[PDB]
């Protein structure tokens, strides 16, 4: 299947509906009022190395002083990879926020620090390949027992608040992935 086709599940953090360049329809945020904090705080900034179509993306977060996440239904097996989209909108030194990302309790990305990767106000992503078969889940080589439900948690740390801007699932490898452009 081609791309918009191949996406189950699509959330644009701290915002309204946005569909992006390659046709990709980020919901309206499932959580509002419920869990967490959004934020427009970035609206006033420009986001480097996005699309400028898109940048409302990333100048619209969910944050909390607390470990939060989203429960995500999964109806059939298969292959599927999971896109996270961030920008660090506030600091500009390293070693300020920082975070770890589960995926069902495996931590699938360890210390996260948006700023020390990309800068302040510029798009970074984060691509994990899974798969769903024989009633596992596996991901980063472990596996674990799948009920029908992922649940994505952005952990609280030392360093300030967990944060994301948006997030999608498509079936498909990694090989299928829009990809940012080279930074620096
Ligand atoms: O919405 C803007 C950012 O809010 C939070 O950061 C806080 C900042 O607004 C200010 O109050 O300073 C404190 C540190 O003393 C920050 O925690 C969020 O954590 C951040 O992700 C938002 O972009």
């Given at each position: ?11 644009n ?29 970035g609206m006033?900034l420009?986001?480097?190395?996005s699309?400028?179509e ?13 470990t ?7 109806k ?6 999971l ?15 920082v ?24 798009a ?41 801007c948006?997030?999608y ?16």
């Open positions: 299947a081609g791309l918009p086709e191949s996406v189950i599940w699509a959330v953090a701290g915002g309204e509906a946005h569909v992006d360049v390659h046709g990709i329809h980020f919901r309206k945020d499932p959580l509002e009022g419920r869990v967490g904090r959004a934020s427009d705080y006033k420009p986001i480097l190395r699309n400028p898109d940048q409302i993306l990333y100048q619209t977060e969910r944050y909390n002083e607390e939060f996440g989203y429960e995500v239904p999964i059939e097996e298969g292959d599927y990879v896109v996270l989209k961030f920008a660090e909108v506030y600091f500009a030194q390293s070693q300020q926020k975070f770890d990302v589960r995926l069902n309790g495996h931590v699938v990305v360890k210390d996260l620090d948006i700023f020390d990767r990309v800068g302040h106000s510029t970074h992503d984060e691509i994990i390949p899974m798969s769903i078969r024989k009633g596992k889940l596996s991901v980063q080589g472990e596996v674990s027992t799948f009920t029908g439900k992922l649940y994505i948690e952005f952990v609280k740390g030392y360093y300030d608040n967990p944060k994301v948006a997030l699932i498509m079936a498909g490898t990694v090989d299928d992935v829009p990809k940012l452009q080279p930074h620096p």
